[PDB]
Subunit: 74 residues, 3 copies
Amino acid sequence: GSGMKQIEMKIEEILSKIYHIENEIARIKKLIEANDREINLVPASIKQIEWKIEEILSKIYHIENEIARIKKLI
Amino acid sequence: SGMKQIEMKIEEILSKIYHIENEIARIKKLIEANDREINLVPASIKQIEWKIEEILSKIYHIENEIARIKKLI
Amino acid sequence: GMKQIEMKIEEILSKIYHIENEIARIKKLIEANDREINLVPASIKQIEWKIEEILSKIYHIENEIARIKKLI
Ligand SMILES: [Br-]
C-alpha cells in the first residue's frame, strides 16, 4: 500500500500548505487596509495647508495695499 | 473507495486553489490602487512648496519697502 | 488510476509553489507602499514649519505698518 500511503501523505501536506496560504492572505488584506487608512488621512492635511496658504495670500494682498496707501501719503 | 475519497479531496483542493487565485488577483488590483493614490501626493506637495516660495518673496519685498518708508518719515 | 492521481498532485504542488511566490512578491509591494506613505508626514511637517515662520513674519509686518501709520 505504500503508493497509496505516499498519496495520502502528500494530500495532508497540501491541505496544510493551503491552510497557511489562507492565513497569509488574511494578513495581507489587513496590511492593505492599514495602508488604505493612512492614505486617506493625507488629503485632509493637504486641504488644511491649502486653506492656510490662501489666508496668507489674502493677508499679503491687504498688506500690499496698505503700503501702497502709505507711499502715496508721504 | 480509498481512491474515490482521494479523488474527492483532490477536487476540493483544486476548488480552494481556484478561489485563492481569484483572491490574489483581487489583492493585486488593490495594491495597484494604493500605488495610484500614493502617487498623486508628491505633485500636491510640490504645488505647495511653490506657493510658499512665492510668499517668501512677497514678504522679502514687503520688508524692503517698509525699510524704505521708515527712512523717509 | 494511481498515475492520474499522482499527476494531479504534482500539478497541485506546482500551483501551490507559484501561489507562495506571488504571495512573497505581494508582501514586498505592500512594504514598499508602506515606505512611500511614511515619507509623507515628514514632508507635511516641514511645510507646517515654513507656514509658522511666514505667519510670524506677517504679524511683525503688520506691527511695523501699524506704527508707521501712527507717526504720519
Ligand atoms: Br498596499
